[PDB]
Design a protein around this ligand. Structure first.
Ligand SMILES: *Cc1c(COP(=O)(O)O)cnc(C)c1O
Ligand SMILES: *Cc1c(COP(=O)(O)O)cnc(C)c1O
Lengths: 402, 402
């Protein structure tokens, strides 16, 4: 018997995805073939260990699949070693931290409020629970990272690991500078490129591989792959240690169906078409930010170098919470985000974060950003209305999903 | 462009699965609908947080999907609370340990050599790295757990957490007694039912819910669901604490497509047909163990109460590794496994573990176990040969696949 109650919900979710504008920066829409791989029979195989060194018989084909994912990841990112088994970006970071540190050691990462991720040191996360944490943010006068301050903090706190990368930072990273700082204090530099991995793959964002000791990432987000994690490095010896932390360290059986999906995603990203997609993602973000600025909003840092940007809602007297609600009411999904030194508490905020990967995948182009900006502005100024919700629905439907 | 190379590999794995006898105790074959859910568009939604308490909007449908999985898990196992977000059985255990203990606390579990899982205290696993581990085993004469011995170990070491359940123990567990022991030292009793969860759901194995403080499990294995984890408890308040450890504690975004698959698997397990399936799983295991015993193989504990059993190959002059390889050579897949008081190192072992969940799903019946036993025996005695390989292939192909 078919589980009709569950499948009725999946149909509803498909409809929801088709009829709204997804502007959450960490979202995207995977291809039908990525889904085909993830929904494959590869889930039936227990394959603890690594290719050619498994703890179960019958892994001959799974080994070819995982090796393919590994080799493609190395070719795509110009890496010498890769681990494609992390179940998520969080597990990728967890394995790396445990391979480079012991509980009690000091971890340095970007403050959550400044754009850092929970796994970069939050007290409610394993990162802050297992390690002592020192955080860096952005300057009040520039809204950008202050390398001089990062260096000062590193020298004073002597972290064992320094993490570069974030979930809500709209500009490029100076990986060379971070590595120089790490070397000065004898710390490992870990770059978490989860958000901008697709841009790195497309050659549209500085490549952290040569500068970081280890690079972690999600396979979803700008890379547009299945939900999961990834680890890369130019140091195979260090890679061997990290492999041991993924298994038997923190995971058991890998999700080989998802690994097959990662291989497919890497195949897609290796095609010239992915660079064109990525160029449009960045152009769309830059243009949408400009169009919103022209309509009366302020953009944190004045713009963006990547796929996302932060809108300062203060010029129009709105809070991030209010903006998120009004937009949600008309079918546009964004998320509130604190602006630098936000005068409002975290549960309220004075801004919202917008990212273009998802709508770009659905066919939105730069010349359509003025319209998107207008719809966003109308929702925030007039508030929700049936007419606006339906205009958004029609626009979304006119841009079919993969 | 289609990733032909990757899909050709998936086709080869489908072929491998169709033409061999998969006897790995922890494997199974998921249904087409479980695969359909896992390969759904639900992977495109970031749902950090919990139903009705998400970080981002747009989870209206996702919440109903996760909630359906939660309520079905509760109904299936008679639990007051459930967390369906763990990415794997390992993450389920990791979250529970971190919710109940602080690094350095004493963790008591079953010795790996006696049947315990690596997450029950292995020195190279997070369990043994973060906590001080003490382990209980089985009696050398009966190869069964001695509750009095377990009680003495608990009183001596005063563990904060005692884990009952294992990945390679062929007999029933006295959960009531384990709870009494935990209570004697004020420890939390955690039951890891990953291997026998399906049997518990079918009412063919003692249910740990009333006695354990917390129950962890995989959704794959005897439960025959998608690859992932699960946590249950008879105490909703303790559940609230554990929810915080899964997120924001050790994970980020949950795999909602997999959670949809969990809902489907729970639906399937709630059907009367699942009880019949589970009955056949146990009957097949008992009969296959008997058939091998009649061929001179020594079965640990002399038989089994569940879906798996261990074969001590020392008398046959074969190591577990050699046996695993010989069988794999003719399409019969198993995994080497240590035997109680095994003299050989883990990398070699003196035995193999066999389980019937997978072949039972394909339609194998107790009356066919005499033939399976013959093929296993011949593979170990005569070694690989195209002739034997073909006989295995024929028997396998005589059974359809989910
Ligand atoms: C998204 C993200 C993660 C975590 O990934 P999950 O798959 O949600 O566990 C970690 N670090 C950064 C910088 C991220 O953007
Ligand atoms: C299978 C198993 C696990 C781990 O599950 P993974 O999904 O492989 O991480 C943990 N404990 C027990 C008893 C298991 O059988």
């Amino acid at each position: 018997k078919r589980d009709e109650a569950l499948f009725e919900l999946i149909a509803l979710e498909e409809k929801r995805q088709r009829e709204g504008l997804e502007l959450i920066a960490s979202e995207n829409f995977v291809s039908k073939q990525v889904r085909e791989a993830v929904g494959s029979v590869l889930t039936n195989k227990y394959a603890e260990g690594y290719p050619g060194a498994r703890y179960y018989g019958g892994c001959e084909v799974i080994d070819r699949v995982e090796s393919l994912a590994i080799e493609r990841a190395k070719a795509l990112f110009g890496a010498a070693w890769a681990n494609v088994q992390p179940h998520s970006g969080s597990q990728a970071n967890m394995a790396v931290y445990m391979a480079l540190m012991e509980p009690g050691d000091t971890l340095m990462g970007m403050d959550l409020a400044a754009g850092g991720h929970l796994t970069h040191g939050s007290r409610v996360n394993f990162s802050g629970k297992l390690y002592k944490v020192v955080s860096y943010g952005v300057r009040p006068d520039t809204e950008l990272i202050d390398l001089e301050e990062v260096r000062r903090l590193a020298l004073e706190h002597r972290p064992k690991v320094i993490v570069a990368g974030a979930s809500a930072y709209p500009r490029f990273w100076d990986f060379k500078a971070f590595r120089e700082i790490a070397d000065e204090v004898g710390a490992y530099l870990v770059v978490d490129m989860a958000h901008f991995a697709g841009l790195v793959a497309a050659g549209l964002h500085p490549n952290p591989l040569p500068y970081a000791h280890v690079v972690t990432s999600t396979t979803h987000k700008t890379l547009r792959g299945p939900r999961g994690g990834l680890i890369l490095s130019n140091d195979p010896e260090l890679g061997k240690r990290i492999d041991k932390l993924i298994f038997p360290g923190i995971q058991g059986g890998p999700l080989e169906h998802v690994i097959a999906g990662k291989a497919v995603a890497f195949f897609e990203a290796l095609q010239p078409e992915f660079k064109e997609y990525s160029r449009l993602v960045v152009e769309n973000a830059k243009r949408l930010a400009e169009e919103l600025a022209r309509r009366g909003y302020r953009i944190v840092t004045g713009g963006t170098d990547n796929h996302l940007f932060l809108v300062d809602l203060r010029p129009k007297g709105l809070t991030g919470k209010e903006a998120e609600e009004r937009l949600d009411a008309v079918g546009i999904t964004v998320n509130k985000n604190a602006i630098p030194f936000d005068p409002k508490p975290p549960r309220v905020t004075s801004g919202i974060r917008i990212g273009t990967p998802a709508i770009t995948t659905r066919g939105f182009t730069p010349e359509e950003m003025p319209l998107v900006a207008e719809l966003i502005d109308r929702a925030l100024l007039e508030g929700p209305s049936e007419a606006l919700r339906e205009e958004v629905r029609r626009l979304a439907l006119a841009h079919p999903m993969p």
